[PDB]
A paper describes a structure:
All active site residues were conserved, as shown by the multiple sequence alignment and the structural alignment, suggesting a general acid/base catalytic mechanism for the bacterial enzymes as described for the eukaryotic counterparts.
We were able to solve two crystal structure for two Legionella enzymes of cluster 3, L. cherrii ApaH and L. pneumophila ApaH. These features might be needed for recognition of the enzymes by the type IV secretion system for secretion into the host cell, or important for interaction with other proteins such as the methyltransferase RomA or the lysine acetyltransferase KAT7 in the host cells, which calls for further investigations. In LcApaH and LpApaH the XGGY-motif is conserved (LcApaH: 388-EGGY−391/LpApaH: 391-EGGY−394). To this end, differences in the sequences in the region of the RPP-motif might explain the observed highest activity as deacetylase while also being active as depropionylase and de-d/l-lactylase. For the enzymes LcApaH and LpApaH, we discovered the highest deacetylation efficiency of all compared enzymes with kcat/KM-values of 139 × 103 M−1 s−1 and 75 × 103 M−1 s−1 for the histone H4 peptide LGKac, respectively. LcApaH converts the lactylated peptides LGKd-la and LGKl-la with comparable catalytic efficiency for the two stereoisomers (kcat/KM (Kl-la): 0.03 × 103 M−1 s−1 and kcat/KM (Kd-la): 0.04 × 103 M−1 s−1) but more than three orders of magnitude less efficient than its deacylation of LGKac (kcat/KM (Kac): 139 × 103 M−1 s−1). The structures show an open active site entry due to absence of oligomer formation and, as a consequence, the missing in trans supply of the active site lid as observed for cluster 1 and cluster 4 enzymes. Notably, for the cluster 3 enzymes LpApaH and LcApaH we discovered the highest discrepancy in the inhibitory potency between SAHA and TSA, with TSA inhibiting the enzymes almost 80–95-fold stronger.
Author numbering: 21 to 409
Write the structure that this text describes.
């Protein structure tokens, strides 16, 4: 076939010691164990096309910068970085989303972290000397070494803002990509399905204040009683506009070309034996938004900043710590997603592909949350039984 499973390389993961994740693992131990499970279903089936971030090949000024960062001087790295050519593709696609000054701060931060080997800035972000480089490799590897349909395991993105990171997210790779795709191609129909139990609030901010010119449909499934603890009255406040009831306690907002759908896991609950209506929506909306793109002779681009911390078998506080308790068995059914939902979700999407493979530009699946080792080492295989076929 034609997919690609990007993973961070071993030298890369070895710079993520100490970076916060949602449980007892740090992002090192997490991504170590996940690439292990992919090394499992890759010796089960050497067709699973896994590539590390090391087959990425960067321009000499970038590698020069990383090398200069190691020599410990902030001023030389910055003047060096400042002297990058403004038409370098990487730089061009970063500045489409982030500020230069945030970038420089990540460079200052990486060098300052050289003192004790890490820099804790806010209890949700930890920076290491390697951290800038490993993210550049992660993003570049996806931007140019992409190819249609692409699974990237790597740091989280959706809580990262234009001039700052939060909730484990340093850089918003999902937005850098999307901006990059509309860069010089005919106007696309951008469709986003962010299944992380937490809210795609950084992404949405970035999309809302810079991409109000493109056709985006951001379907955001999240539980408002967990981080970032923002509800429909909040989102009514951002968009300066009351939400439009799309049925089933689901509300859409519009900021120009952006149309943001809050499928609230707590307002929108599973009817008894059924599949969770959240995914059910995503598939219906999607299928609709594709036909709309065929009608307007326009192409589509799909993005899945998905986390598994919305699976019913997560244990992490950002998934199960709601309203003062941990969700019991029963409540886990009606508000969290199960393997049958996911096997329905992904099986659906992949099925939609071959009916409109022409009318696709590229699809991208980006790991976000997911923290219980048992739960993710299994959903990973579930994805790999499905990416296989
Ligand atoms: K979080
Ligand atoms: K979400
Ligand atoms: Zn999450």
């Amino acid at each position: 076939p034609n997919c690609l499973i990007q993973i961070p390389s071993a030298k890369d993961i070895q710079q993520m010691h100490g970076m916060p994740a949602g449980a007892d693992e740090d992002q090192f131990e997490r991504l170590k164990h996940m690439t292990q499970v992919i090394a499992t279903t890759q010796s089960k089936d050497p067709s699973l096309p896994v590539v590390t971030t090391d087959r990425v090949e960067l321009p000499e000024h970038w590698n020069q910068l990383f090398a200069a960062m190691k020599k410990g001087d902030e001023n030389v790295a910055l003047t060096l970085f400042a002297e990058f050519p403004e038409e370098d593709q990487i730089l061009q696609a970063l500045l489409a989303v982030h500020t230069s000054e945030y970038l420089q701060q990540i460079i200052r931060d990486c060098i300052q972290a050289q003192a004790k080997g890490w820099k804790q800035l806010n209890s949700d972000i930890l920076i290491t000397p390697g951290t800038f480089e490993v993210l550049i490799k992660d993003i570049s590897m996806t931007l140019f070494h992409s190819k249609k349909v692409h699974f990237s395991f790597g740091l989280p993105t959706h809580h990262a803002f234009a001039d700052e990171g939060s909730g484990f997210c340093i850089l918003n790779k999902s937005a850098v990509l999307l901006k990059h795709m509309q860069r010089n191609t005919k106007p696309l129909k951008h469709i986003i399905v962010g299944t992380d139990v937490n809210r795609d609030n950084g992404l949405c901010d970035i999309l809302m204040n810079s991409a109000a010119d493109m056709d985006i449909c951001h379907i955001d499934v999240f539980d408002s009683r967990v981080y970032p603890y923002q509800d429909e009255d909040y989102i009514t406040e951002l968009f300066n506009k009351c939400g439009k009831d799309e049925g089933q306690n689901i509300q859409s907002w519009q900021r120009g070309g952006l149309d943001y759908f809050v499928v609230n896991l707590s307002r929108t609950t599973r009817k008894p034996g059924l599949v969770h209506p959240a995914l059910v929506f995503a598939i219906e909306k999607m299928e609709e938004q594709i036909e709309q793109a065929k009608i307007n002779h326009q192409k589509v681009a799909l993005f899945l900043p998905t986390g598994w911390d919305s699976h019913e078998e997560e244990t992490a506080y950002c998934g199960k710590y709601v309203d003062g308790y941990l969700m019991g068995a029963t409540e886990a059914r009606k508000t969290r997603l199960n393997t049958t939902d996911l096997t329905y979700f992904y099986e659906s999407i992949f099925k939609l592909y071959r009916e409109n493979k022409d009318h696709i530009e590229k699809v991208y699946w980006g790991l976000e949350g997911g923290y219980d080792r048992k739960m993710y080492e299994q959903q990973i295989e579930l994805l790999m039984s499905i990416v296989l076929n």
